[PDB]
Structure formats: C-alpha cells, structure tokens
C-alpha cells in the first residue's frame, strides 16, 4: 500500500524524499534512470525496437489501452 | 476576535514540527486517559487565546467564546 496523495497534502519530509529521489533519479546512469525512463513516452522513440531505423513514439494514445499504458 | 497574534501561522521552517504538533504528539504518547486529557486540554486552550486576543467578547473569554462560531 504505497499511498499517492494530493501534492498539496504532502509533508515536508514527504516532499523531501521526492525532491531528493527525483534528483538522484536524474543522475541515475542506469537504464532505469530518469532520462532513460523519459524516452519511454516519446523521443527518442523506442517502440519498434530500441535500435530500429524507423522508430515510432510510445503512445498507445487514441486507444482503449491508453489508460493502462500510462 | 482580535487575532492579535497572527503569529500562529509562524510555524517552524521544517514545517512539520509545530508547537501544536509537539504539544499534541506528547499528549498522544500517554496511555492513561487522565494523563492524556491534561495535556490534551491545554493544547485546546491555545486556540481560544490566540483568536480571542485582547477582545472582551471573544474566543478568549470563557463567557463569550461559545458565541463565536469558530
Ligand atoms: O501522455 Cu501520453 O498521455 Cu498524458
């Protein structure tokens, strides 16, 4: 039960963690890292394959699957 | 209500720790109901004074306080 709350409700400590965590995430060299994670949604496009000539953006947008993907 | 002391909003910088919180948390600590109540009640008093302030007919006074909707 990880809890998601309104951003406003959040405690300073709660905020503290998020700020530090994201900042560290930014640094994260790993594929799990933030920059890498960002690429999932859009450019660089990963969808057809991570290395493919034509790449499309990962958007199952305009589809029923859309909420699940997000 | 003469909340002369607007100072109430002057919480701590960490922001979680507040006077109310410190006071309340301590009250929570006691197992005994009686012990709990003494701490509990005093914490209760602070708001009455803070809002009522100097004003003769207000939260601050036992007589008048029930009149205010706060
Ligand atoms: O981004 Cu693809 O949806 Cu909000």
UniProtKB/Swiss-Prot annotation, chain A:
It comes from Megathura crenulata. Cu cation 9 binds at residues 41, 61, 70. Homo-didecamer, with two decamers assembled face-to-face at their open ends. This didecamer form a stable 25 nM cylinder wall. There is a cross-link at residues 59-61 (2'-(S-cysteinyl)-histidine (Cys-His)). Potent immunogen used classically as a carrier protein for haptens and more recently in human vaccines and for immunotherapy of bladder cancer. This is Hemocyanin 1. Belongs to the tyrosinase family. Hemocyanin subfamily. Hemolymph. Disulfide bonds join 47-58. Probably N-glycosylated. The didecamer is almost evenly tagged by a total of 120 sugar trees. The chain holds residues 1681 to 1750 of 3414 of the full protein. The protein is composed of 8 globular functional units (a->h), forming a 'pearl chain'. Each unit is separated from the next by a linker. Since the lengths but not the exact positions are known, lengths are indicated here in free text. Linker lengths in amino acids are: 20 (a->b), 13 (b->c), 19 (c->d), 16 (d->e), 14 (e->f), 17 (f->g), and 17 (g->h).
